[PDB]
Scaffold this motif. Structure first.
Motif, short mmCIF file in Angstrom:
data_model
loop_
_atom_site.label_atom_id
_atom_site.label_comp_id
_atom_site.label_asym_id
_atom_site.label_seq_id
_atom_site.Cartn_x
_atom_site.Cartn_y
_atom_site.Cartn_z
N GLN A 139 -9.58 -16.56 28.44
CA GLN A 139 -8.99 -15.50 27.80
C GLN A 139 -9.63 -15.12 26.49
O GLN A 139 -10.13 -13.81 26.38
N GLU A 140 -9.83 -15.96 25.80
CA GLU A 140 -10.60 -15.62 24.42
C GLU A 140 -12.02 -15.01 24.74
O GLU A 140 -12.55 -14.17 23.95
N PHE A 141 -12.85 -15.59 25.73
CA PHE A 141 -13.99 -15.04 25.99
C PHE A 141 -14.06 -13.45 26.67
O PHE A 141 -15.21 -12.86 26.63
N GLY A 142 -13.00 -13.12 27.40
CA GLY A 142 -12.70 -11.83 28.14
C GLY A 142 -12.76 -11.99 29.58
O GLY A 142 -13.12 -10.75 30.00
N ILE A 143 -12.87 -12.95 29.95
CA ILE A 143 -12.68 -13.26 31.55
C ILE A 143 -11.21 -12.85 32.20
O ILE A 143 -11.02 -12.39 33.05
N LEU A 144 -10.12 -13.43 31.13
CA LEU A 144 -8.84 -13.23 31.51
C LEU A 144 -8.22 -12.52 30.50
O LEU A 144 -8.32 -12.54 29.36
N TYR A 186 -17.06 -26.35 32.37
CA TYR A 186 -15.76 -25.47 32.67
C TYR A 186 -15.01 -25.07 31.21
O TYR A 186 -15.06 -25.80 30.30
N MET A 187 -14.29 -23.98 31.43
CA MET A 187 -13.33 -23.68 30.35
C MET A 187 -11.96 -23.63 30.89
O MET A 187 -11.57 -23.57 32.04
N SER A 188 -10.99 -23.80 29.93
CA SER A 188 -9.69 -23.57 29.97
C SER A 188 -9.15 -22.29 30.38
O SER A 188 -9.78 -21.19 29.90
N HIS A 241 -17.55 -6.65 32.04
CA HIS A 241 -16.07 -6.83 32.06
C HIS A 241 -15.50 -7.65 31.04
O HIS A 241 -14.24 -8.03 30.64
N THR A 242 -16.32 -8.50 30.49
CA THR A 242 -15.78 -9.54 29.21
C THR A 242 -16.10 -8.67 28.14
O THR A 242 -15.48 -9.08 26.71
N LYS A 243 -16.69 -7.41 27.78
CA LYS A 243 -17.09 -6.81 26.34
C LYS A 243 -17.75 -7.94 25.46
O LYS A 243 -17.86 -7.83 24.32
N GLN A 244 -18.57 -8.76 26.14
CA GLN A 244 -19.64 -9.46 25.34
C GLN A 244 -20.89 -8.96 25.53
O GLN A 244 -21.23 -8.12 26.37
N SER A 245 -21.63 -9.30 24.45
CA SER A 245 -23.02 -8.98 24.58
C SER A 245 -23.85 -9.61 25.69
O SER A 245 -23.60 -10.80 26.18
N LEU A 246 -25.17 -8.92 26.27
CA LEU A 246 -25.79 -9.56 27.18
C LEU A 246 -26.30 -11.06 26.55
O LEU A 246 -26.32 -11.96 27.25
N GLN A 247 -26.76 -11.34 25.46
CA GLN A 247 -27.13 -12.22 24.62
C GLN A 247 -25.96 -13.26 24.69
O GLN A 247 -26.31 -14.81 25.04
N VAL A 248 -24.72 -13.00 24.24
CA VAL A 248 -23.51 -14.19 24.60
C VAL A 248 -23.40 -14.53 26.12
O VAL A 248 -23.33 -15.63 26.21
N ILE A 249 -23.49 -13.42 26.93
CA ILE A 249 -23.22 -14.02 28.15
C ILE A 249 -24.64 -14.95 28.63
O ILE A 249 -24.10 -16.08 29.32
N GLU A 250 -25.73 -14.70 28.19
CA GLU A 250 -26.91 -15.45 28.95
C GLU A 250 -26.81 -17.01 28.12
O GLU A 250 -27.04 -17.76 28.95
N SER A 251 -26.56 -17.02 26.90
CA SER A 251 -26.30 -18.31 26.38
C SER A 251 -25.23 -19.05 26.98
O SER A 251 -25.25 -20.29 27.13
N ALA A 252 -24.26 -18.33 27.35
CA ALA A 252 -22.85 -19.03 27.79
C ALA A 252 -23.26 -19.57 29.15
O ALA A 252 -22.57 -20.66 29.66
N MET A 253 -24.05 -18.74 30.04
CA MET A 253 -24.11 -19.22 31.32
C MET A 253 -25.01 -20.36 31.64
O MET A 253 -25.03 -20.93 32.52
N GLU A 254 -25.91 -20.47 30.48
CA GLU A 254 -26.59 -21.74 30.21
C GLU A 254 -25.95 -22.91 30.15
O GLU A 254 -26.38 -24.25 30.61
#
Ligand SMILES: C#Cc1cccc(CN2CCC3=C(C2)C(=O)N(Cc2ccc(Cl)cc2)C2=NCCN23)c1
Ligand SMILES: C#Cc1cccc(CN2CCC3=C(C2)C(=O)N(Cc2ccc(Cl)cc2)C2=NCCN23)c1
Ligand SMILES: C#Cc1cccc(CN2CCC3=C(C2)C(=O)N(Cc2ccc(Cl)cc2)C2=NCCN23)c1
Ligand SMILES: C#Cc1cccc(CN2CCC3=C(C2)C(=O)N(Cc2ccc(Cl)cc2)C2=NCCN23)c1
Ligand SMILES: C#Cc1cccc(CN2CCC3=C(C2)C(=O)N(Cc2ccc(Cl)cc2)C2=NCCN23)c1
Ligand SMILES: C#Cc1cccc(CN2CCC3=C(C2)C(=O)N(Cc2ccc(Cl)cc2)C2=NCCN23)c1
Ligand SMILES: C#Cc1cccc(CN2CCC3=C(C2)C(=O)N(Cc2ccc(Cl)cc2)C2=NCCN23)c1
Ligand SMILES: C#Cc1cccc(CN2CCC3=C(C2)C(=O)N(Cc2ccc(Cl)cc2)C2=NCCN23)c1
Ligand SMILES: C#Cc1cccc(CN2CCC3=C(C2)C(=O)N(Cc2ccc(Cl)cc2)C2=NCCN23)c1
Ligand SMILES: C#Cc1cccc(CN2CCC3=C(C2)C(=O)N(Cc2ccc(Cl)cc2)C2=NCCN23)c1
Lengths: 174, 174, 173, 173, 173, 174, 174, 173, 175, 175
Positions: free
Chosen positions: G162-167, G155-157, G138-151
């Motif tokens: 929006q820029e990461f693709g959640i919103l 919190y994000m604004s 749903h964000t159109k990011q790669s698995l690796q970008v997601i995994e490093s980000a969830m680590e």
């Protein structure tokens, strides 16, 4: 609680060797029994060497405080009272009960004779009047001055307490 | 609990070597067993030297108070009872059961023979009558006077309890 | 617990050959009472032991363990009741040596039992108590059974008449 | 609590419409107030139609049970008492207080007049009130009531019938 | 609790003449089950009532109050066990009308009783249960007594063989 | 719980009028009685129209799960089972006991037939074998394969549970 | 909870009439069941009228959140997600799961995809990977970008989200 | 815990000096560790002198009781077991595991081998270990042990002697 | 705790004088610090003399189990492990970690290597893989075999634990 | 706690110049650790001191009090990690003297701080965090930005990874 040595004593036992009895914290029957046991022991070791009572107490059970008072009146020894921190309610009665000339306070202590707050209404006021009469006797104030003063919910400084007759001396150093 | 040299005892062991037995606080089976053990022990050291019982107690379990009472009557020694603070319910029965002429209070104590409000109704009254008969015997008041007095939810001063026959001497000093 | 002269007062009692049974009887009270009886037997097989009883009762099997030890040892055992002996308390009082079961005068004695196992086991245990009480009071089973149904206490002299104790003592004989 | 229709009524409201008052579980001031309100209500609807009191109770607060007893005696209606399960202590007093000839039990019920377990004199004054009430309604003497009440036991419905607590033991209408 | 068409689902069950006995049996469960049986009898003296039992057991006297009501009313009573009928649960299952006692196929039935009153009363209650079970299973007292000592559950078909139930049902007949 | 117009029902009453029975959360006797009452009720409205059981459940009391199971088998209706979230322990037995061809999961559900770690050891194993036989029948796996699988403390994806025979259809959309 | 009238509704029932489903507070099986019931009801009333999910949630039970996600994917309706306050852990997965173009946030909301913190280690990571794959999709990011980000515990604004693709959209007024 | 002098020793230390190990109250890992430490200690003092194990236990954790059982079998010493009060469940396993001819009970003890009440297969594997242990030491067949263990009941010492759990019932030395 | 006899000691002190260290009950950080203190003390008294570890445990905190494990591997002493009652989860890791040829059970013990069911998911798997490598190493089984046996929620008898490589000898009586 | 020969075993460790930091750090633990460090310094301000660390963290100000006492005393200080060193535990591990910071091989190390303290204002919590950033930078010789990014990551490191990052010097199996 730490141990001290010349002879090894825990520090509270060392205080008893100096003829100091500590009345810290709320007064209940158990505190009164241990305080009374020490007062009677120290008289046994000597009838006339002064005894020192250190008082930092918010008060406690009236009948337990009167048991301590009655023992203080009973022994022959001069008793010097010292207030650190505070003496409220029964604590201030014990402070004012010391030998005349020998009731002391450190300079930042707080003193209250106002009483805080199972038995019947007639008994609560009989006890109240016993306190009125003890306070009048040791402060040299009239019953009426005591009664109106105990109705005020407030603490006094050591110097007001000195002027009212609870205390003789305010310190700072030896 | 502080330690005192004489030769190192905690102060309650020192009281016992002076032949003083403390009855402080509510009476229950474990208080009674400890008091009884000390009374027998002091009897075994000497069946003639008086024993002193110090009482500051709001009462407690009736059967446990009756065990102490029966032991006091059993031993040969004269027993001096001393009330400081209060002696209420079973506490005041033990005070009245001292050896005649040797029952005392300090001046500000409070004494109550009224009893506080799992067994049957017949058993509760049987116990109550055992107390009526004990108080009548040691005060030398009649059963009906003991019965009406104990109905009064009251507390008495040391001087009243002297006139009633609960105690003999009200003392302020030695 | 005060110290006497060195000895805490309860150890001094054990030195007099006194074993105390104060309070509810459970397995650890029974383990301590039994340890003491067997100790005192090994000091002298023949010297009397004194059992001070002030107890509302307690666990039946713990009570019967003390009972069985009392019958086991060679010593005569004087029982003394102060305060009360209710339920298993009064079984242990009644089980002292014939002639040496005593009470002070204001004690209360009760043999009624108060109100996890099957109903058959509760009745088996109850009948063991009936047989013990019948043997040491010398009353019949029917008399014991009817008396234990009455929820009441007895005075020392009535317990003496019923056969629970031999003597009501006011002062040292 | 399920609803029954005729109009919608919870089932306990339906029973009261039948002139049935339920005395279930321990008796306390709350239960007594509700029972009394219901007895008085039913009298005001008719002071002749019988009232039925269904009792399944281990007992409870004596003064609360006496409040119910007095109301039962005060109202003019015949009162039929029915014991199901058990009627113990105050429970059995209310059962025995039904109108004569109208006191019933189901066959497997248990009935006890022993009382379980404020000043000592007041506890006996209350117990004496219970002796007098039981003697009046069973027609036994005071001495028979006192001995019976010190026995810690239940009776069967037939025994309770012989004693005078009940008139009839049922199986079916 | 959902609403059906207006009717909460448990009141709709009562409209089918179904009385539910789910869960531990205590005095208030028994008061509600009894209220319902007597209500359904007054709707029709003759129409069958259905009792759904899923219960680990509960208070014996509460169980016997339901039992006595079941025998009292004129109606035939079909009992159905789902899940389990243990202890007093299985007494109520066995007490349905001869021929109309049922179980679904994966139910567990137990007549062993699990492990405040005197020992004599506990045994009296136990024998009332022996006599009830002997009467409705048609087994002898000795057989009932020995079976209740075994701490185990029975399958529906074994309970059928023992006489607790008449039919093990998989689908609607 | 929100209300919806159709004619005013809380939303769970509305689910029931759609012939949906919810099995959410731990199964106990009171969950089972409510589920059973609804299954019989929906059968009485129509013995032919399918019933839909929605299952999101970590398991629960075995006998209560078996009561639900036996009712499902007793009624005439086809029963569609749907897993969202999870179906573990008894939850997954109810899911497997749906009418053949009509057992489903949503894509991210988790399914477990391993059973979680007062009765006797014989009784616990008798129950366990009742579960072995139920799972073997609805999955058409052998008893030994059911036994080894349930020893694995695991969880399976919807597609694995399809291959094992616990369910028939894994759906993402209508 | 207050009542409103044109027709009377408690206010949450009135929100359901607007096709709004509230996901407030921690997500557990009970919240998921009520949210799912509402999503399915609203589709029943109309296959294509948009549904609105209001999310202020610190997260909750993973399988219960995935049950909501799977239902959102299942219904045909466009679903607009709105974040007020915060969307953490499972709350942010539901926010990012809305229909593309229609995922919104008010300007002061906080968004976290870091996961906080009984089952085996293999199962915890299987669930973790399911989250990785939903977020990537749903964000159109790669698995690796997601995994490093969830680590990253942070919190994000709304605008970083929006820029990461959640919103898709950050608000302020209609 | 009183002190006894000879040197000062708490009474439980005096017992261990007698080669007595006490197994009182529930068996858990803590009790097992202390019992085992004592058995091994006594063996190291002499691997020939008998060890006495005094048991008054309702049972407890099976694996903890098996740890004690294995240590009892491992040490070379004769081991005399003595039951006072009760030996139930693991309690009775340890009593039956004493050296043959050396297993005793006092007369009023109660003995139970029924077990009260992790995965299902593991609960039965443990129960099978207990069946094999009881069969070995009582010399009954497995089938006799299993039927006996499903009966929820206690035995008297004489019954337990007939069954093979004990060798001797005592009254006095 | 009873007392035993020069010199007199509580029985747990007397155990340590025999070079016995007990791991009874759940393993947490304070049990681990005590067992470790005892292992290093015994090593300072004799570096070569065997130490005996008595294990009756249901498991406990993994990092605390590993801290005992690393100490056992660290000291120079041979370590005999003895299982009575049970060795489950971390308890059985410590049992398997004794000196080759000196790992024992009494006959009725139960052994389990299945791990029971705040940290992140990645760390839980990191720790699980450390357990797999320790068990593989001391049992001489493959990783795949260890991974599959640990998925099974069951207990082993002493003889199957012996055949699996967790221990060397099942003993009923001394030698 | 067993007795060795009289000497409880934790007192025997102190005689070896070993100080134990087990379990959570709070003011009482810090008081006892500081007392021991100053004691050992007064015995000899040159003989090395040994800190054993198995700790999940704890109160920041109480960890910093131990850190400052470590830096104040003259002795070389060897740090040893077993089990784990998380949050304030890893700060203490990293604060040993250079070349003397060690871990056993299965320990877990974390410098992420958990989401403790009297509750405090937001500016105070960040002031404390920046104190920890600086301490870690100084002893790992990493820049502030690498420290900051690394502590944002909610994860544990192995000992060898902690050794590359500059938290410890030596990972060892035996001596
Ligand atoms: C509660 C109380 C109480 C308070 C004030 C006076 C009394 C009267 N009591 C009355 C009896 C009495 C007393 C004094 C006494 O002071 N001493 C000497 C002694 C006491 C304690 C210790 Cl530790 C050492 C020495 C004493 N020796 C035998 C009796 N006796 C009670
Ligand atoms: C409960 C109780 C109880 C109460 C009042 C009298 C008795 C009878 N008992 C009866 C037996 C008895 C007695 C006195 C006794 O006073 N002493 C001497 C002794 C006691 C205790 C201590 Cl510490 C030291 C000395 C005694 N030595 C052996 C037996 N014995 C009980
Ligand atoms: C549970 C129990 C139990 C109760 C009553 C008798 C027995 C049998 N037991 C059986 C064995 C036995 C016995 C007596 C014994 O009385 N003594 C001497 C001894 C005991 C304790 C102490 Cl403190 C001092 C001396 C003894 N020394 C070795 C064995 N042994 C059990
Ligand atoms: C507590 C109490 C109490 C118990 C017994 C008698 C009384 C006397 N009381 C005295 C007063 C009184 C009474 C009866 C009465 O029975 N009713 C009619 C009525 C009552 C209740 C309901 Cl529901 C419906 C109708 C009545 N109407 C006005 C006053 N009054 C008290
Ligand atoms: C506790 C109890 C109990 C249990 C079983 C039978 C009885 C006797 N009782 C005895 C009296 C009696 C009965 C039946 C009766 O069944 N009904 C009709 C009725 C009842 C309830 C409802 Cl809802 C509807 C209809 C009835 N109407 C007046 C009296 N009465 C008790
Ligand atoms: C617990 C249970 C149980 C489970 C499975 C089958 C049965 C047998 N039972 C047996 C009896 C029975 C049944 C079905 C029935 O399905 N219905 C129709 C009905 C039921 C509920 C609702 Cl709300 C509406 C309609 C029915 N009406 C009278 C009796 N009866 C039990
Ligand atoms: C948990 C869950 C779950 C989630 C996503 C899809 C399904 C499949 N389910 C499968 C079955 C099903 C469905 C949809 C359905 O959406 N509706 C219409 C409806 C539903 C609820 C409401 Cl209040 C009103 C109308 C429906 N009517 C009969 C069956 N049925 C489950
Ligand atoms: C848990 C456990 C366990 C149970 C049964 C046997 C073993 C094997 N173990 C094997 C090792 C061993 C043993 C015996 C031993 O009995 N003693 C002598 C000793 C023991 C305790 C005490 Cl207090 C005093 C003396 C011993 N001294 C060194 C090693 N060792 C375990
Ligand atoms: C936590 C931990 C830990 C575990 C495994 C190894 C080490 C390294 N440590 C490294 C340092 C060290 C060690 C060993 C040592 O074993 N002894 C001797 C000693 C220790 C304790 C006792 Cl009671 C008696 C004798 C030692 N004396 C000074 C330093 N030192 C830690
Ligand atoms: C909280 C704190 C604190 C931490 C670090 C340094 C200081 C400064 N302090 C300053 C004062 C001081 C110090 C050191 C000192 O290390 N010793 C020697 C000593 C200490 C403890 C023990 Cl058990 C034995 C010997 C010392 N003897 C008198 C004063 N003094 C505080």
């Amino acid at each position: 609680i730490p141990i001290v040595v010349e002879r090894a004593y825990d520090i509270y036992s060392r205080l008893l060797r100096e003829r100091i009895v500590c009345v810290m914290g709320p007064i209940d029957d158990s505190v009164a029994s241990l305080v009374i046991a020490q007062l009677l022991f120290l008289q046994s070791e000597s009838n006339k060497k002064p005894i020192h009572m250190y008082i930092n107490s918010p008060g406690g059970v009236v009948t337990a405080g009167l048991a301590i008072y009655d023992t203080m009146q009973y022994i022959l020894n001069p008793i010097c009272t010292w207030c650190v921190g505070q003496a409220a309610s029964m604590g201030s009665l014990l402070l004012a009960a010391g030998t005349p000339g020998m009731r002391h306070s450190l300079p930042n202590s707080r003193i209250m004779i106002h009483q805080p707050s199972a038995i019947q209404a007639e008994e609560i006021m009989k006890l109240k009047k016993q306190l009125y009469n003890i306070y009048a006797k040791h402060t040299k104030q009239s019953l009426q001055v005591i009664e109106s003063a105990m109705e005020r919910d407030r603490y006094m400084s050591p110097m007001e307490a000195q002027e009212f007759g609870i205390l003789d001396k305010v310190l700072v150093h030896p």
